Amino acid sequence: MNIFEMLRIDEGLRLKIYKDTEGYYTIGIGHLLTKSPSLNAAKSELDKAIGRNTNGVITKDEAEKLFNQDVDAAVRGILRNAKLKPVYDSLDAVRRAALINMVFQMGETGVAGFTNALAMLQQKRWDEAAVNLAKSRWYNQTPNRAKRVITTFRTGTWDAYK
Numbered sequence: 146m147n148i149f150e151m152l153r154i155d156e157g158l159r160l161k162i163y164k165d166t167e168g169y170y171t172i173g174i175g176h177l178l179t180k181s182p183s184l185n186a187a188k189s190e191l192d193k194a195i196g197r198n199t200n201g202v203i204t205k206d207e208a209e210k211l212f213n214q215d216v217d218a219a220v221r222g223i224l225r226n227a228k229l230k231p232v233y234d235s236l237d238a239v240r241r242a243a244l245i246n247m248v249f250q251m252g253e254t255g256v257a258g259f260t261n262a263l264a265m266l267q268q269k270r271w272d273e274a275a276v277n278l279a280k281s282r283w284y285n286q287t288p289n290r291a292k293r294v295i296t297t298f299r300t301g302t303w304d305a306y307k
């Protein structure tokens with residue numbers, strides 16, 4: 146398993162503009178287009194991201210291309226973040242994938258906010274961090290995805306995904 150595979154499982158793949166769990170316009174593999182309620186605004190952002198008049202539909206290749214960019218942006222965002230970087234650097238391979246998933250999902254800023262869980266992860270107190278991570282809006286809104294990520298941090302294995 147790897148990060149791409151993991152995120153592909155959590156986000157799925159849709160080739161036509163859809164609304165995410167928060168009601169925002171998204172396409173592909175969890176690629177958020179806009180938080181605006183306007184579908185045209187969405188279509189406009191899609192066209193701009195893809196580089197052609199799409200009419201709200203993209204191909205599989207196009208989808209994977211946005212995905213590759215997005216995973217790369219997430220990693221680079223972590224590495225650039227003063228709060229995240231040290232955490233990421235301290236972790237094993239599996240658990241770094243967990244941190245990336247969270248950033249992919251909520252953004253660097255959102256994640257940098259789990260101060261306490263961050264300190265706990267860095268200190269390798271697995272069970273404590275999981276308990277803290279679960280007390281969050283994130284967990285209450287997308288409990289199954291959150292539980293998968295949380296288990297990965299707890300265990301250091303891909304079991305939640307097999």
Ligand SMILES: [Cl-]
Binds near residue numbers: 194
């Ligand atoms: Cl983009």
Ligand SMILES: [Cl-]
Binds near residue numbers: 287288290291
């Ligand atoms: Cl969920």
